[PDB]
């Protein structure tokens, strides 16, 4: 195993280092506005060294954006695919690449058999080629790597099954900025090449000047280079035709033949395309070839890529003709005029890459190595696309919830083979495809029109319901004596209970467990733990009585705590935001202990008075002018007081101090240690009154944030033996700090209401001497070092915070982990900040055609970990990566993959068992079974189960290792006949494993294994 901490990789281009050196001046470069006037030596190409030009027809089909997926499919895409089939069938030399499999699959299953056969033939013969082959072309900023893998697998599995092809070249022309998580996943999924487009205009200029637009992209910690993936970065401002034939859009636009009036399109540079004829072909070719030779100067080989397409292009038959015929005339002339020394033709993406590598092998070029990312993107001037790191935060949080429910449903149901009547495969396929669809770069990014956001939400809601059905049927089967098990596959044996989604104050959706001497004395509940190690976590349920006690299935008492159910209300009468306690329902909380990838059953039983092993929290409402707060049968009376500073300590954990406004002010790690200043503050950013306006994509603040005026907010303090909390109703945010004995959990119920042109940010102020350095993660996979650059505007220093961020000095680190992707930064030494929501009245001119005014209440969750790190073995100052500590990593897992909770729905569970998986191996803490998926239906003689294993890398800080058993996923199910290492999509076998044992992987490595069972 490579050391990913101590050896700084030696690469030709390291993006953080390149950013430190670059000046980012936005000067007018001439016709290539963001470059310079390219010059070339006409003698470079000659009879023995020609410029091979591949023109690659393409059509960017967004799976939802300004129309929903189905609206686009009906109005545009089915026509594009139908006409592509006819035109490619009829014109053997014409070519076309396709990226979005969600649309292709939708189309293909509607085709008659004769057309399916015609389609397979034009793919088989190479005329229609799939690029990437994922369900979508995903966002690369907010997406979790697990979901990027899920959607890639969904599209490629469909392609393998129906088209018998697996793309090894990737095409990503529209994500807003690019992440190294893509080559990471692609290289481990058989890919050999990838192409990207949206990178900062300054970076395009800088790499173009050095001919570094093609590079071997390796991970920031990879010293050896085995993660490297050849990457082609396009050089210009857009993938449209005016910005793909060469440096001058005024000339390239003349070669987009769809821009001649009857189609309703024109060239904004005011020179229209002209039909090619024998009388103008020589002059037209001379212009085009000159553009091509200029573009060729920015690359190292004599093979040139010229994409030919735009959004939803190649729809009308007349469009196919006008593009094809004119280009065929140009190729015939150019290829027959020896003085150009060019051979041009339609081609596919793989053909381009194959020719580039043939040139490379001929010793024609050597390519530079590069590590780093390409955030944050600016397409021009100071227009940085950091707004979409936060836009539509309700759905960004929903993405993480569904991410987890999909993994839990696929894992719980993988243990058994299911009768087709159970519709398990059917519900999982729907859940994987709806979550996969949302990975689209207009989905999770929050950049679609209002009604399209609604469509994604409805689809994800359907997926959540599908997951719940599969999970509850699975739990019933796994914990019921086999000879008693009698499933009704349409019946709900259990109801899932989720405490944080949609969340308190968002939707009253949780069921109350109703107990009573005259109706039902007890109720079974079951917890599932998808992580491969034993885990304890507090869980809560709503119950109709405070007099409830908990036992495990051996009938051992379990210590519990009951607290009231508090809800916050904006009182339009008193004009205050204050809490009301339920007089009919209460929260019972207890520690559940669950086996690795297993289940544990408990019983809640009512009694007529205080049970021996249940305590009751005290509650203190701090506000001037209090009124009574009765709580029905709750045994402890609420207390009142004027606002004041408070301090709390649960268990032996940290002691937290709060200001009289209910916000954290300090954290004391141990009884001895100092009270470390850690202050939470909420602020707001506005929009500029002159110039460019912030919108769904762009963040264009009218200067640094201003503090939210807090007034004298109502603060609620609940203090219990297992859990305490401080909650405060601030304008637009009910802010809560919850303590359970370790790092606190923070929850924000964010309701930006009608605050137009406002972005609400949550900031942490400390005295940590971080200077201009901070760390943020990429796709929940790795942490990358960021350096705040004052030479760039505020919005350029915002980065994606998909799951965590931290700052540190030689002795102290503060890490903030998130349960949803949001945008954030560290704008001053000692600070961390992350945006909660943004409501923008104006459109930001990137084609959406609207502002963001559809905000709704969302419950954001976090864990806040203050730690001493002076004893940790950290990367040197020159290393571009950062790594979490064990505590921070576990805190992240508590947010993203919490225990799942199930309430038995009927009165009695006959044949109930107390546990499942007690014999599963409890793996080392840095290892995860990211995916467990049965890959065969029940009729298959040989059953196959796929596993994706990921090992992160945690800092060595002096805590002795200890125990843990080796995890061999191939022996998790019995009767194993074979074990194979496969690509991450499970589509190709890479290794036949000895003894049928799946070895664990190295730090920062991810592998996939498939076990076969007789
Ligand atoms: O913006 S508009 O001019 O409509 O169209 C452009 C040129 O065809 C496209 O690049 C728009 S891209 C397509 C869409 O997924 C992105 O959210 C847009 C971000 O700008
Ligand atoms: C699928 O493609 C392979 C080569 O890529 C070919 O040999 C095979 O016949 C095709 N169909 C099958 C047998 O699955
Ligand atoms: Zn797009």
Swiss-Prot record:
It is found in: Golgi apparatus membrane. It is a single-pass type II membrane protein. The active site is at residue 174. CDD domains: GH38N_AMII_GMII_SfManIII_like (cd10809). InterPro entries: AManII_C (IPR041566), Gal_mutarotase_sf_dom (IPR011013), Glyco_hydro/deAcase_b/a-brl (IPR011330), Glyco_hydro_38_C (IPR011682), Glyco_hydro_38_cen (IPR015341), Glyco_hydro_38_cen_sf (IPR037094), Glyco_hydro_38_N (IPR000602), Glyco_hydro_38_N_sf (IPR027291). GO terms for biological process: encapsulation of foreign target; mannose metabolic process; N-glycan processing; protein glycosylation; rhodopsin biosynthetic process. GO terms for molecular function: alpha-mannosidase activity; carbohydrate binding; mannosidase activity; mannosyl-oligosaccharide 1,3-1,6-alpha-mannosidase activity; metal ion binding. Its main location: Golgi. Its cofactor is Zn(2+). Zn(2+) binds at residues 60, 62, 174, 441. Pathway: Protein modification; protein glycosylation. GO terms for cellular component: endoplasmic reticulum; Golgi membrane; Golgi stack. It is an enzyme of class 3 (hydrolase). Induction: Inhibited by swainsonine and by copper sulfate. Binds 1 zinc ion per subunit. Its EC number is 3.2.1.114. Pfam families: Alpha-mann_mid, Glyc_hyd_38C_2, Glyco_hydro_38C, Glyco_hydro_38N, Laman-like_dom. Residues 1-1014 are lumenal. SUPFAM superfamilies: Families 57/38 glycoside transferase middle domain, Galactose mutarotase-like, Glycoside hydrolase/deacetylase. Gene3D superfamilies: 2.60.40.1360, Glycoside hydrolase 38, N terminal domain, Glycoside hydrolase family 38, central domain, Golgi alpha-mannosidase II, Golgi alpha-mannosidase II, domain 4. Keywords: Disulfide bond, Glycosidase, Golgi apparatus, Hydrolase, Membrane, Metal-binding, Signal-anchor, Transmembrane, Transmembrane helix, Zinc. Homodimer; disulfide-linked. Belongs to the glycosyl hydrolase 38 family. This is Alpha-mannosidase 2. The lineage of its organism: Eukaryota, Metazoa, Ecdysozoa, Arthropoda, Hexapoda.
